[PDB]
């Protein structure tokens, strides 16, 4: 193949020629984003009961819901909160790989089918379904600076002119308004509606009778009489619209005439729908939407598309209005792009420089130069071919799998230019030559490393997803490196190539090349030395060789492992829960004692603060609150001191001074999508009716043993805790002896306290909701109730108090289930230095002392760890046994492949060494790198080994042969580590945005290729000879 | 449709729409009529069951589950004033007109409003001159639009969509088709002289 | 209602969250004064149809909610859009016993 | 080059498919009163003042292909096949020219 | 209900939407004695039951708001299931404590 | 998918009564598993055969 396109260098160029064009075809054509799909695919059902208790929800809607959820491809787990604002979530989790548009369709219609055995209230509301990955691009707000507009206010402006251009802006996907459309509200006034024995029960049919769309029809319709010849629809009214038409949908009139209006018994104005949700920018009431990027999108290009649609939009804003850009991805996705190019440029400079220095020749400088773009762009084709897309980890795969292009390249030309000048060959001729040489091994080494990568590819789950963007990224490059190395580059250089005179290694040039020509000859014959040296006193080294192992592996334990590295997105977050009892303007102050606080004294790192009242992360409802912290760019606040991770340990201080609202500040989880990164989770469940109480005496039990655990730590339950709540109890024989119905008074107390949705108006052309409630100062107390009548068999009010009676309980203010049955959610992780498999060792067992009736079931991450767990080591043996198997036939042996496999340890020591060293973790991107630096240390092995039983085979001594295939080597080797060292430094020293990972992947491969370029040049020959000598 | 009744290449040119039409706006009250007559809304059925054919359940007929509809005489239902004959209740038992309560007139309103990319606008079809193609058709259409009162513009749609695609493409079809036998003829004959002699 | 409400109320609506399908060519909806709309979807050829159905079903139902009361309770229509008849199979009586 | 710019573009070439189509569409506000009269002449001044092309005439009276209602009516023209039909004249292009 | 109550409130206000369904083979249906109803749609050799059911649906949604409220409030099953019985899991008691 | 009952239901039977055992009454899947474990054996006579 090699001897074939060295005589066809142009059908060589062709190829290339292609592969660039498919590639940069490619290159625009495919997504970018930050993330592939990391999480399971997950479906959230969602609907709010106006009024209702986390009991009714989930009594009413969630468990029927439940009951219809199955008979659905692919279905992991489903789990469920019902909460006290009466919204619940059902989210439907399946397997990595469901089509979510499928998993989305499965999940509605059986919701469909459950419709119509919820109550007619929830019915009406509607009940959403959506896809929940919550991996959203960035965050608008739309925030009124002065005072003018309320959060309800800007949120019908975000859906009335915002919205649907924000929907038609290219790359836009799904998104969520923080709010509304505008609902018609009527306030019922208790007293002013008891004066004309009226109830709020009448309000509502009146509501209906004078708010209906008349259907009427048409004026010579179908059949008609025999001529007419004029036909023509005849429109009636349509629904009301404006709050005064509202006012005067008239109830009853008085004996002496007088008509009773609406205005007379409540006030009427447009407002929220729902108003459980508060949030503030800065202080200032806002709204804003959340937006995600559509299948296929460029995270980019979309990012700039929105703030155009937006700013087209400014002008005409209302005054006080305005737009604003918290939370945005594009900052990190933008600066991992360029920090990739950047470092994919400098390592082919590089590679020029250490061509130059080494081979003193500009035409052998060239050859790197055209090849490894080759192979970059190839790479991107191969990638869109199989379905992936340009981000983060396929990023850093192409970083990683810089050392492997890099090296192909210069081996190939490295050692047709010591061919002519060892043997004076013309370069045609060294070329083949060195392709007879080279080429099986390096059909070789493809194999080998596909048997090292591949297998990261089957992890399952969602840490398999991760993997799988670096696996498929690197063995592209790595296999079209092959394939160039084998096509283009020997063509290359047959083509591009002057002579040598037979002997010339330069050390008359004089000058800096003569020193350097001179000083490396020497340093050559040193090490020739060293290496004969050793093979003369193998047993010490041997020996030594035992205890590098030993060392890596004491050192592995002992190491930090984690999930990924500690990055700083912009953002720090921040969980306010006050009392249970606290209203939400409690709770409201808590959160801005933080804003003044975080915006003035924070200044240095804090840009603006997003608060929000009844809702949280564990929770809603109204003592739930919390801050979303930004942060200004990374560039404009520097040193550890305004670090999220140091900032944080500030803001955690001031707000434990917090004895009266518990506050928590935390950075972010690696990927948001994902959640909670390292630590556990799961849910103690119900499975035999054994009842809410005796389920918290589990938790409970649960939580005070896990804490005498040290094994564990920072075990909280995710949920709520039980909240006082006031019963009303009604005694049915005063009611009913008062001539009192119970229907009245069930339609009383829900169309007054809870709230009813009636009808629908129409507001400025589309259509919005009636609702009706009880004006505020009259659902304050529990006196407030004695305040509202109910109007009997004849026509007397009958005041709440005279039937009706409280008494202060308990009740949960948020119900969860998972899978079908009650259950409890608990966090926590591992005691410091313990692996999360150790924690649900420890968890397993304290499991054991619940009640009776009482399971549990991992979920999240802890469910996926505890399959993908057991896989690991299947792969691993797998990978061994075919690179094993490779070598066997490469070598023609069972026993020399034994002399390439123990560099493995010679390279992993300096990576665990530098990253230990430096305080990192044995995260994802040190595995990967892990594996890269053990890549091209197996690579410089397989060559070492391959030419000394070449030699040897051509009728040469054991040790002579080693001597000199090491000599033959070491140029190469020693070129493509100094190339690809320096070319990772950046990455190793960077700051900034994405800097957490450029150093977890700089750290350790500037570790591990310094190990194993100055071990393996040693032991390697050890080895070789050392399984020959047996 | 003026300018392409005129315009020389163009034939056949129509609209898809309905300019508008008569409209009876049957605006009521409640005042006047709650007075001495209905509470509520008693004869919002009484309008939509006799003009308006109302479907009340199904029966079945030779076999087959089949509507029963509900609609008043034709006769009950022609004209304006037509309409008064029907008489609804009242409170008291008694028997309330219509047109104590009546009040209908003439509007006009669109029977058919379009909308294409989310903005209101109306389909217009049309035919090339005898002995013209589609694409000069298009080339005077492109023309006969530019008189229009800027806030309306144009979009091309269906078999014209397909056209206007159609001639963007052909440029990198010849181009990219021109490439490949160049290379494919440079490759399986090792040279830049015979692909470059082919393509001239 | 008028084809001025069926527009304002419905139509409008749905369109809103056809926006963003996969492989989306254009959108066209006409809304009459006899209650009735219709909204077309179009997409680019390769567009699997069983697909484009299922994700046009998956985006009305978010409409559904804001739809008046009168529609989310009726039961939305949702095909495959062919603009062609294959044939019409008529029937014609010949002795004058049935009429159409 | 020159020679390229003075070609005109279509997209597919006129066929002759045996078949026609009527577009009727009285001014609104009318009935199948006039509509249907409107109609039954151009199926006449079409099935006997031309039946060297023509074949059947199925025609119809509320739903065309632009809207409802009964200022609205149509026509399926079939023809007879193509070797009953000389050139010219009995085309399509020709048999809705003068037929237009 | 009577057989003849499902057939003529259920299973045939059903079936007559059945109709616009890719791959269709054959509908059958069963009312009986007890108030349960089938309808079974089986279709072509090759069809992606997914879509199958996605269809099915979607044409049950039309006739569902005709169905009795009580039929609606029972909750209707869509299931895309092979016809044999795989197995049957029992539960027996003990110490005899425990019903039917 | 009758291992996953089967698991299904050993997942639940630590929560079930006292005076209560599930059973297996009409169960399709052991003619498979006894049909291939069946050609298995013949598989091996044959290649002894041989
Ligand atoms: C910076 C890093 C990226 C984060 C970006 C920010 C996140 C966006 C938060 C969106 C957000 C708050 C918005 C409020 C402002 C918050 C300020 C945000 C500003 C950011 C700078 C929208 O909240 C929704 O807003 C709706 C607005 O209408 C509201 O509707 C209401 O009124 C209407 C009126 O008519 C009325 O019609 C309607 O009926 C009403 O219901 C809903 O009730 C309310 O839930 C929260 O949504 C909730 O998210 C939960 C957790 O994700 C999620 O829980 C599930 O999924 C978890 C997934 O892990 C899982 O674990 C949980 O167990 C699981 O339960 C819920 O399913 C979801 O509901």
Redesign the interface.
């Known amino acids: 193949m090699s001897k074939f396109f060295i005589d066809?260098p142009?059908?060589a160029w062709?190829?290339a020629?292609?592969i660039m064009?498919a590639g940069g075809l490619s290159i625009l054509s495919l997504p970018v984003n930050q993330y592939p799909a990391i999480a399971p695919p997950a479906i959230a059902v969602q609907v709010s009961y106006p009024g209702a208790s986390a009991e009714t929800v989930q009594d009413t809607v969630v468990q029927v819901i439940e009951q219809?959820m199955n008979?659905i491809?692919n279905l992991r787990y489903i789990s469920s909160e019902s909460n006290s604002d009466g919204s619940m979530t059902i989210t439907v989790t399946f397997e990595q790989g469901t089509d979510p548009?499928?998993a989305?369709?499965?999940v509605?219609?059986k919701l469909?089918?459950?419709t119509?055995?919820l109550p007619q209230e929830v019915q009406?509301?509607?009940?959403?379904?959506?896809k929940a990955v919550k991996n959203f691009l960035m965050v608008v707000g739309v925030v009124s600076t002065d005072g003018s507009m309320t959060k309800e206010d800007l949120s019908n402006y975000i859906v009335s002119n915002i919205?649907?251009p924000l929907?038609?802006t290219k790359g836009?996907?799904?998104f969520q308004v923080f709010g509304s459309q505008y609902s018609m509200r009527i306030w019922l006034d208790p007293a002013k509606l008891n004066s004309y024995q009226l109830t709020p029960g009448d309000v509502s049919?009146?509501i209906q009778?004078?708010n209906?769309?008349?259907?009427?029809?048409?004026?010579?319709?179908?059949?008609?009489?025999k001529?007419?010849?004029?036909?023509?629809?005849?429109?009636?009214?349509?629904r009301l619209q404006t709050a005064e038409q509202f006012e005067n949908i008239?109830l009853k009139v008085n004996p002496d005439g007088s008509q009773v209006r609406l205005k007379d018994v409540a006030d009427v104005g447009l407002g929220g729908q729902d108003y459980s949700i508060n949030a503030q920018f800065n202080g200032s009431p806002a709204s804003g939407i959340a937006i995600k990027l559509?299948?296929?999108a460029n995270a980019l290009d979309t990012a700039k598309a929105i703030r155009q649609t937006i700013a087209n939009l400014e002008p005409f804003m209302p005054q006080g209005m305005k737009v604003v850009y918290p939370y945005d991805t594009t900052p990190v996705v933008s600066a991992s792009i360029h920090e990739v190019v950047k470092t994919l440029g400098e390592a082919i400079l590089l590679v020029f420089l250490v061509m130059y220095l080494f081979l003193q020749n500009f035409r052998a400088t060239l050859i790197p130069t055209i090849a490894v773009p080759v192979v970059l762009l190839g790479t991107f084709g191969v990638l869109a071919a199989f379905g992936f897309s340009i981000n983060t980890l396929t990023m850093f795969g192409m970083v990683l799998a810089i050392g492997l292009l890099v090296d192909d390249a210069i081996v190939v030309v490295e050692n047709v230019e010591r061919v002519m000048a060892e043997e004076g060959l013309s370069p045609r001729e060294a070329a083949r030559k060195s392709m007879g040489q080279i080429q099986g091994a390096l059909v070789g080494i493809a194999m080998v490393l596909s048997a090292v990568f591949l297998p990261m590819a089957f992890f399952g789950g969602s840490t398999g997803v991760i993997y799988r963007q670096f696996s498929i990224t690197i063995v592209s490059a790595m296999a079209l490196s092959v394939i160039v190395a084998l096509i283009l580059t020997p063509a290359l250089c047959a083509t591009m190539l002057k002579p040598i005179e037979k002997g010339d290694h330069g050390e008359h040039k004089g000058g800096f090349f003569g020193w350097f020509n001179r000083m490396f000859l020497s340093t050559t014959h040193g090490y020739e030395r060293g290496v004969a040296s050793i093979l003369k006193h193998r047993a010490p080294y041997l020996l030594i060789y035992v205890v590098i192992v030993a060392g890596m592996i004491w050192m592995f334990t002992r190491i930090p492992t984690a999930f990924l590295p500690d990055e700083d997105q912009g953002v720090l977050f921040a969980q306010v829960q006050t009392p249970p009892g606290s209203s939400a303007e409690r709770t409201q102050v808590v959160v801005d004692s933080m804003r003044e606080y975080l915006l003035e004294k924070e200044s240095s790192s804090v840009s603006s603060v997003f608060t929000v009242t009844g809702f949280n992360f564990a929770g809603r409802g109204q003592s739930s609150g919390m801050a979303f912290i930004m942060l200004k760019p990374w560039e404009e606040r520097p040193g550890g001191e305004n670090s999220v991770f140091e900032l944080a340990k500030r803001a955690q201080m001031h707000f434990f001074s917090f004895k009266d609202a518990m506050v928590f500040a935390f950075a972010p989880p690696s990927v948001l999508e994902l959640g909670n990164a390292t630590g556990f989770d799961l849910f103690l469940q119900d499975?035999?009716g054994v009842g809410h109480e005796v389920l918290l005496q589990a938790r409970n039990k649960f939580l005070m043993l896990a804490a005498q655990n040290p094994a564990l730590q920072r075990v909280r339950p995710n949920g709520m805790s039980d909240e006082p709540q006031y019963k009303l109890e009604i005694d049915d024989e005063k009611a009913s002896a008062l001539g009192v119905s119970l229907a009245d008074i069930n339609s009383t107390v829900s169309i007054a306290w809870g709230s009813s949705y009636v009808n629908?108006f129409?507001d400025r052309?589309?259509?919005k909701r009636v609702y009706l409630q009880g004006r505020p100062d009259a659902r304050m107390n529990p006196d407030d109730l004695s305040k509202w009548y109910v109007r009997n068999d004849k026509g007397e009010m009958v005041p709440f108090n005279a039937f009706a009676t409280g008494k202060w309980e308990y009740g949960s203010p948020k119900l969860e289930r998972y899978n079908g049955v009650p259950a409890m959610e608990i966090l926590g992780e591992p005691a410091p230095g313990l692996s999360s498999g150790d924690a649900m060792a420890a968890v397993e067992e304290i499991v054991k002392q619940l009640p009776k009736?009482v399971?549990y079931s991992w979920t999240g991450l802890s469910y996926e760890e505890r399959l993908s767990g057991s896989q690991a080591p299947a792969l691993y043996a797998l990978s061994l046994l075919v690179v094993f198997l490779c070598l066997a036939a490469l070598y023609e042996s069972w026993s020399i492949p034994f002399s390439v496999m123990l560099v493995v340890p010679l390279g992993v020591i300096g990576a665990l060494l530098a990253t230990s060293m430096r305080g990192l973790s044995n995260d994802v991107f040190f595995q990967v790198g892990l594996l890269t630096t053990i890549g091209l240390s197996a690579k410089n092995a397989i060559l070492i080994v391959e030419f000394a039983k070449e030699l040897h085979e051509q009728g040469k001594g054991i040790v002579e042969a080693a001597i000199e295939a090491c000599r033959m080597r070491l140029r190469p080797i020693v070129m493509t580590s100094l190339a690809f060292i320096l070319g990772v430094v950046p990455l190793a020293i960077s700051t900034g945005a994405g800097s957490g990972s450029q150093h977890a992947i700089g750290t350790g491969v500037i570790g591990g290729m310094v190990t194993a370029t100055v071990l393996a040049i040693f032991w390697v020959p050890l080895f070789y000879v050392a399984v020959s000598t047996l």
């Open positions: 066809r142009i059908f062709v190829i020629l292609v064009l219809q008979g491809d548009d499928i989305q369709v499965q509605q219609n469909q089918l459950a119509p055995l009406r509301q509607g009940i959403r379904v959506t919205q649907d929907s038609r836009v996907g799904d049919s009146a009778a004078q209906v769309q008349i259907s009427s029809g048409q004026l010579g319709g179908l059949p008609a009489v001529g007419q010849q004029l036909n023509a629809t005849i429109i009636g009214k349509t008239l559509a299948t296929g499975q035999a629908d129409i052309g589309r259509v009736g399971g």
